[PDB]
Amino acid sequence: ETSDRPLVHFTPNKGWMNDPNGLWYDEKDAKWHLYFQYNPNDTVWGTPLFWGHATSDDLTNWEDQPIAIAPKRNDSGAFSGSMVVDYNNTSGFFNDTIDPRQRCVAIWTYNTPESEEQYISYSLDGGYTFTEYQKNPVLAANSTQFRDPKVFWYEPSQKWIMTAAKSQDYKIEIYSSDDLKSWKLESAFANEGFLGYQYECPGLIEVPTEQDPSKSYWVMFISINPGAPAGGSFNQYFVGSFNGTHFEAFDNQSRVVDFGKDYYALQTFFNTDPTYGSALGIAWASNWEYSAFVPTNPWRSSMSLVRKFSLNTEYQANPETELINLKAEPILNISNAGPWSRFATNTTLTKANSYNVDLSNSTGTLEFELVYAVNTTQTISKSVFADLSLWFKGLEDPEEYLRMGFEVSASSFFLDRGNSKVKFVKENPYFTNRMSVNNQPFKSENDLSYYKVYGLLDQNILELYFNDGDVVSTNTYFMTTGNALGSVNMTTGVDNLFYIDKFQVREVK
Amino acid sequence: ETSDRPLVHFTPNKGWMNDPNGLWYDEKDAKWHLYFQYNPNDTVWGTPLFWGHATSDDLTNWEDQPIAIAPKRNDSGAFSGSMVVDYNNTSGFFNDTIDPRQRCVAIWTYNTPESEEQYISYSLDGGYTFTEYQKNPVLAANSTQFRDPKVFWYEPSQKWIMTAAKSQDYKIEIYSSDDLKSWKLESAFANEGFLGYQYECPGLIEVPTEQDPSKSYWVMFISINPGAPAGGSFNQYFVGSFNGTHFEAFDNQSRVVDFGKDYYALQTFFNTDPTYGSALGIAWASNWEYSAFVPTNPWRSSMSLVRKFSLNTEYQANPETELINLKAEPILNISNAGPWSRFATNTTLTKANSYNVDLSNSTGTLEFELVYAVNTTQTISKSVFADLSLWFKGLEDPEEYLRMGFEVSASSFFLDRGNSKVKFVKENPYFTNRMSVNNQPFKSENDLSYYKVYGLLDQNILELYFNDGDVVSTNTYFMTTGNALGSVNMTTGVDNLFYIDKFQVREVK
Amino acid sequence: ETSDRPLVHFTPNKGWMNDPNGLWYDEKDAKWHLYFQYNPNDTVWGTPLFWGHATSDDLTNWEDQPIAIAPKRNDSGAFSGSMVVDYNNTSGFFNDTIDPRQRCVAIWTYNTPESEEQYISYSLDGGYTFTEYQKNPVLAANSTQFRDPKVFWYEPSQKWIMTAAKSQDYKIEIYSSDDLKSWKLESAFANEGFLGYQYECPGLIEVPTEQDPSKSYWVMFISINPGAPAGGSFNQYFVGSFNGTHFEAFDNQSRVVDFGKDYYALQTFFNTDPTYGSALGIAWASNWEYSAFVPTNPWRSSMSLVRKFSLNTEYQANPETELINLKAEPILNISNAGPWSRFATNTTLTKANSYNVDLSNSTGTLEFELVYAVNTTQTISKSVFADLSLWFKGLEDPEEYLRMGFEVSASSFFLDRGNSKVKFVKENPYFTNRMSVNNQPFKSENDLSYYKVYGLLDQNILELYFNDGDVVSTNTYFMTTGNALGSVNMTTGVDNLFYIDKFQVREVK
To answer: What residues form the catalytic site here (chains A, B, C)?
Structure first.
């Protein structure tokens, strides 16, 4: 008996999924390639571990493909890694029969009980079938904690640059090779923090500055688990500069990619179709603490949406200073949807009365657009919970719902993914019920502070996009199967504080 | 109608409390001094805001004292700050009638709607009554975000050193004076991260190294709120060196003081009785997200226990590398307690059978000592929740309980402070139900991994001390008043994995 | 609706059982032989009465065998008796073909509605089928009721010595023979403290001493019944002197074998495997006052465990001058060894709180080991119950439990086998539910008196061994079919009187 399956997030047909792998794009075929850590046998993690494969041409709708990479041994696994396109046959695997735009090279960690090493594989049919390089490994550091190779092309020095993690040494080593079969250690960075327990899935990418597309700075992605500050797993980032060997963040500073409880092992694509325009990144939407116990069958784990990255240099972190902040915008080919439903368009909503639209047969996947404004001046008020709340109740059974909104005194956007049923939510001591975000206004008109929120609910996953992706939160939710969360309710406490500029909901497929 | 009041944690008699202030110790009188942010009028935060005052001689039992500092204005408040003892009358406030050991100088932020500035006050009776310095401020930087002055004596340069926060500038400025009334900006630090929204309550102290006392390194404490990674508030630290003007952390790295949801605005004492031996620090046990809505009357907010700080250079952060980790050990004059109750002393538990002791009339305050061991080799096991769980059920009403323990697959120590009632716990979208810690073993006997946990329950608060304070977690809990959590139950999954070396419980007053 | 059936005590296949018969050991095939009074038709006592047969090589796990001795008449019965191994062919039966240590001769009573004679029978297949002696009986008359013949070899006088019960004349007669076919009357026994009481199942064996296993004393076992008004069925012993014709009881050397209510008709083995080393004895674990009404189906009656008897010449306790004391240790071979579950060890018990191990899937056969000390110091002891109590309950339904423990004021170990919903416990007025034992401390170091007690629970039978067998108590108990005293609990009155050195429970199969 199956569960409710996300409609616009990728899940495997059956079995177990984690880290996204070998992300790249086929220019001549117009196909996006998604590879992933995959265990087809059980519905939890286990060895042998494979590279699953799925293709799309809009990043919202997927086609299953045969297993891409396998370990020689049952003991072992074909762990995480990335892909590159060798246009100029620098590896020497590709004839003139193989299109330059189609020259796939997978770089991956072969984890065996004895050691973790780096292997490479090539494809002659456009990234569906892969053969190992005859003399693998292409990098061994005599270690059991050496994995997750992400590699890009650096024009100036004419090299492939690999950023890989010396996991439990809290070190991310940078290697270089023109050949791609021979790797030279260039630098190590470093002890960045938060450390936790391990450095996993590192990434290094030029991210175009917002407002000046022409400019861009370098971003370092590190994911850590266990030992995240919120508990378990999470993805951090650094903004700085890359010279060809060393990376330096503009300042000593930690920042998180996603504030939600379920967003890990983010990898960016090697190339894009722009249009969309790199940087583009996807992540595994879960948390290692309880990822193996979520109530889904015959599969476990969904990916997040692919997100367009950009750097916002003028992000008002608070009302005094501005910081260079990572902006993540959603990629979603809506396909066929509508119509909108709306509420308190241009009204100041009051405690006594509350709004509702219930979409009597929503598939359980819907999106909403909300722009609210706090009074700011003045209204005072404390000791009274000053919230604007959205309730996604219903639909076969309300009282089973997720609550979210903003409270003025806390200055944070909350989510309540308890309530309920699904004993797993009621019993699993790692499945957090509540988290906040601390989103900031985007403008201030005449004494009203304007905040905006875009959100997408897809059966078992919720993504919130504050100020068009200036802040993001990704959390999974589990309701009592077959329906629905179609009863959409707005509520407030405090007769005169929140102003609804705009609120819209619609079903999405 | 009153609530259940913590027996060995400080709470105000009535009203509202937050940040601990002006911590110092009277050598000739043998009295510890605790000051705190205090609103005597309402049971939430509000201006006028005062410095409350309480004294102890064992740090576990307190005596209430009259309000120590007040703002001139109702608009205003006497915000956070620290105290120093001016043995050599460098301020010139003290006659030869006033004992050197008793020469109190309070340094505090006078917050007014127009600006935040630094004031000083002196005491002629041993820190009970305080008079302002005639020419306050002693430091103004033309700002509304400039507060929380912590000051210490630096022998080498013969100066008072003030570390204070330029809150929303993410800057912690270091000032110097030999006078205490004329301050000179020496350096700024910096953009350390996690930034969040603000830098609050900075602290700078020499913390003696564990294993070798003779050595010590400098620690920088920064607390931030809102915008903590786990949501809301939290306290971070940096380990490094202080030259007299600038501070540098040994590496660029973030680390958290307390992983629990309720531990903020930590200030260390200016001096101690050693015996106890500085560094010693206390903190406000709550989280700004929901601190004003907790169900207690006629007071709100408890402090944490005072903790003896030490640096552990050889802390096994993971099985490969060691890090310089902050160690926090509890200060608790047990007073009169016992006897112990014990369980599976030197046995390996099995899922079939479970242990229980219910202390039929526990006051609701008790401590426990647990040393467990994972089998490690091998037992494999996955897809099965592999936990050792403690249940503090009962006592008038079980089914209302807090659960905690360790799960092998997650490698983290969990806490479940839901279950239940207490409408605030069931309803308040900021009161997190669950958090983990990711504690590490202290030793491995052949094919086993030994972990230790000390915990103290005090009516509404729980402190966990992993490996004698190598890792700490502070979380408040609210059960249905009058009783009790006296039903202590141990439980396991997977028949043969956990080995109980030791487990003891006893009532504490 | 078969009922719960003891796992380590012998019970018949089906039907009624009582007095154990013809106990001996086959040295060639390493097999213990147990015979018993048997009615395979009805589930109560009746004629024809047979000799049931069962074998074992560890005295714990048994094997059903065909009926060994049968009466010639359905009118009559083949009553109680013993067996001998005739190595030296002194009987006149037995070819050179039959192995010396395999030449068993049964001596038994052939009770008829008309007469009561003494028959002997030989076996040629090592005690599985028996043939009667052709010139039976071997004893003519009168016979005033004459039964329960126990026969043994005597080296000095080179004779078979037979001890038999003369119920009508309140005596025990001793007979001699070398042929085994013709017996001469020699003496009689004895006090006489109980006359009017019926003498049954007598036995005469040399019992080795503790501290010197080389020495031994003659011990005369008598089963005395009854007087319901009087204490009721009890198994008695006399330490004394046997010259070869007469038995001398040492005045004041006489105690009951087992202090329980369900231990009767004791017979010792004729020969043993040492290893275990004779004296070894087994008893019918029931009581004539109600044995025919116990709720077991399709069988009635279990035997007890086989016990290794030894004399403890140094006993004291009372501080009154010491006397020779009989101590019986259990013979029990464990198949499913481990694992122990324990309570509070090295600990002082307080009234306010209790201990619990909940053995969820125990069959109802478990063993326990308790070592407690009573604090003589002061603890004056007002007139209130000063108990240490063990409780067994559920599992399916508690409120159906058996209680036992030590009460200081009364200086005895009580047992309350009441508290059952079973009809024959509520209804049967001769089934007493409460007994106390009066165990004595083994060690009196400091101000604490140390007591040891081992106990085995087997579905319907409980056996308590105090100080490793110095005193024993055997009582059957009946609890609603299926489930099963698994909830093991410890409770006490009086806050600071009892110190638990050791308590531990374990399942036995």
So the answer is: 19
Residue B288 amino acid letter: W
Phi–psi pair at A427, nearest 5 degrees? -120, -35
The region, left, alpha or beta by phi > 0 then psi within -120 to 50, assigned to residue B409 is alpha
Spatial separation of the C-alpha atoms in residues B390 and B400, rounded to whole Å? 14
C354 assigned binding-site residue = no
**Has A4 been annotated as catalytic?**
no
Burial grade of A260 (CB within 10 A; 0-12, 13-18, 19 or more): buried
Dihedral of CA atoms C420, C424, C430, C431 in degrees, nearest 10, equals -40
- Which of B191, B403, B428 lies nearest to residue A252, judging by beta carbons? B191
CA–CA dist C43, C15 (Å, integer): 4
Resolution number, Å:
3.4
- B464 closest CA partner among B479, B447, B483, B451: B451
Q: Please check whether residue B19 is in contact with residue B45, taking contact to mean a CB–CB distance below 8 angstroms.
A: no
Cα–Cα distance between A252 and A238 in angstroms, integer? Answer: 9
| Contacting B residues, span 329-388, partner chain C, CB-CB under 8 Å | 339-345, 347-348, 350, 352-362
Judged by CB atoms closer than 8 Å, whether chains meet at B292 and A253 is answered as no
CA–CA gap between residue A301 and residue A11 (Å, rounded): 6
Query: Which residues, including other chains, have CB under 8 Å from residue C163's CB and lie 6 or more apart?
Result: C149, C150, C151, C152, C172, C173, C174, C175, C202, C203, C204, C220
Fold for C1-333, please state it: Tachylectin-2; Chain A (2.115.10)
CB B62 within 8 A of CB B51: no
Give residue for tokens 């030989």: C122
Q: Quickly tell me which residue has 């024959």 as its tokens.
A: C424
Closest of B82, B65, B66, B108 to residue B25, by C-alpha: B82
The torsion angles phi and psi of A271, rounded to 5 degrees, stand at: -150, 165
Domain with CATH 2.60.120.560 in chain C: 334-509
Residues of chain A with CATH 2.115.10.20: 1-333
Alpha-carbon distances, residue C330 vs C62, C88, C203 (angstroms): 16, 32, 20
CA distance A107 to A86: 12
b/e for A320-329, b at 16 or more Cβ within 10 A?
ebebbbbbbb
The amino acid sitting at C378 is: Q
From CA C224, how far away is CA C202, in angstroms rounded? 9
Give the contacts of B220 (CB within 8 A, at least 6 positions apart): B163, B172, B189, B192, B202, B203, B204, B237, B238, B240, B247, B249
Strands B461-466, B387-393: parallel, antiparallel or unpaired by DSSP?
Answer: unpaired
Nearest residue to B152 via CA among B208, B202, B98: B202
- CA distances A389 to A353, A374, A417, A492, Å, are 13, 13, 14, 6
Angle, alpha carbons A133-A138-A142 (nearest 5°): 135
Can you tell me the distance from the alpha carbon of B7 to that of B28, in angstroms, rounded to the nearest whole number? 27
Provide, as residue numbers in chain C, all residues whose Cβ is less than 8 Å from the Cβ of B339. Answer: 347-348, 350
**Interchain pair B356, C356: CB under 8 A:** yes
Residues B410 and B416: their CA atoms lie apart, in Å, by: 15
Per the CB < 8 A criterion, the answer to whether A52 and A68 are in contact is: yes
A259 contact residues in B (CB cutoff 8 A) = 229, 231
HEC states along B17-44? Answer: EEEEEEEEEECCCCEEEEEEEEECCCCC
Instruction: Phi first, then psi: give them for residue B318, nearest 5 degrees.
Output: -150, -175
Domain C334-509 has CATH 2.60.120.560: yes
Give chain C positions within 8 Å (CB) of B362.
Answer: 353
Binding-site residues of B for substrate:
16-19, 37, 79-80, 147-148, 200, 288
**What is the least distance, in Å, from the CA of A232 to any CA of chain B?**
7
